[PDB]
Amino acid sequence: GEWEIIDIGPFTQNLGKFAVDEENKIGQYGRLTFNKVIRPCMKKTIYENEREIKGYEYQLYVYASDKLFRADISEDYKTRGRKLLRFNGPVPPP
């Protein structure tokens, strides 16, 4: 895809919250509460057919219950539906 850094304002904060809510449904790390999203946040755009946008993926660093996790989120272009792809950690700060 094509990659860019985006900042960590309200849009990205709500993506961090979405990731913690989705991970809480999974349960592998017990019950988490969102604390913060830190830099860098990466956005991948995926293209299909003749340079048509198929969707996005956002790579986030997220503090939840004081532990730092790496979360990857997909967003389908047509439906705007979001899905948690992976949530791993604790990871060292970037």
Swiss-Prot record:
Q: Which UniProt keywords apply?
A: Taste-modifying protein
Keyword Lipoprotein carried by entry: no
The record, for InterPro entries, names:
Cystatin_sf, Monellin, Monellin_B, Sweet-Taste_Mod_sf
Q: Is the keyword Magnesium in the record?
A: no
- Enumerate the residues marked as the site Blocking, abolishes the sweet taste: 41
Q: What is it used for? A: Natural monellin has not been mass marketed to the food industry, primarily due to the challenge of large-scale purification of the protein which is relatively sensitive to heat or acid treatment.
Q: How does it assemble?
A: Heterodimer of an A chain and a B chain.
Q: What does this protein do?
A: Taste-modifying protein; intensely sweet-tasting protein.
UniProt name for this protein: Monellin chain B
| Organism in which the protein naturally occurs | Dioscoreophyllum cumminsii (Serendipity berry)
